[PDB]
Amino acid sequence: DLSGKMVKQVEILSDGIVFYEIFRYRLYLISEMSPVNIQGVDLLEGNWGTVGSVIFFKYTIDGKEKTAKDIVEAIDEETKSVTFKIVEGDLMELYKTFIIIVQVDTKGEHNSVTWTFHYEKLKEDVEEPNTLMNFCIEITKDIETYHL
């Protein structure tokens, strides 16, 4: 009831392999590639690209500065997937639980990035995370257009 799921697949022009490299091992590059959206990506514990690593994000949503602390809960290298669980931050005032999965289809033929949110709202009247999903799609477009 308070439970929800949201899925968006977007086709990318850029190399899926580089998208996965970013999201697994070089996540700090997103501050450079989507500087309107992301002001800081700071590793707090562990190492980049390892399950159990803890990462702090400074980001802007609707011109408001927000933060989150996330743990990397899962990595699947064969499917090119990484699962982030948000443990602290502005989102935790609206959601009890929030999990973000990013998965890159690297056929090479055509490449795409699928974003999945699994969340538990604190109340029934809390909104579905549409704005966050728009935010994630904007970062994807910023990343794929960064090379040009």
| Residue from the set 10, 17, 51, 122 that interacts with Cl ion by CB under 5 A | 51
User: Measured from the CB atom, is 2 or 51 closer to Cl ion?
Assistant: 51
> Are the C-beta atoms of 129 and 119 separated by less than 8 Å?
yes
**Judging by beta carbons within 10 Å of its beta carbon (0-12, 13-18, 19+), is residue 102 exposed, middle or buried?**
buried
- The answer to whether residue 47 forms part of the interface with Cl ion (CB under 5 A) is no
Task: Indicate the residue among 25 and 146 with the shorter CB distance to Cl ion.
Answer: 25
Structure tokens belonging to residue 14: 């850029």
- φ/ψ region of 61 (left if φ > 0, alpha if ψ in -120 to 50, else beta) reads beta
Q: Which is nearer to Cl ion, 45 or 128 (CB)?
A: 45
Stretch that binds Cl ion, among 26-34, 46-54, 88-96, 109-117 (CB under 5 A): 46-54
Contact 11, 107 (CB under 8 A): no
Minimum Å gap between C-beta 72 and Cl ion is 8
Kindly tell me the sign of the dihedral angle through the C-alpha atoms of 114, 6, 91, 140: positive
For Cl ion (CB under 5 A), the number of binding residues is 2
Decide: 146 and 18 in contact? Cβ < 8 Å. Answer: no
Q: Which of 50, 131, 134, 145 binds Cl ion (CB under 5 A)?
A: 50
Closer CB to Cl ion, 70 or 144, in the complex: 70
**Which residues here bind Cl ion, judged by CB under 5 A?**
50-51
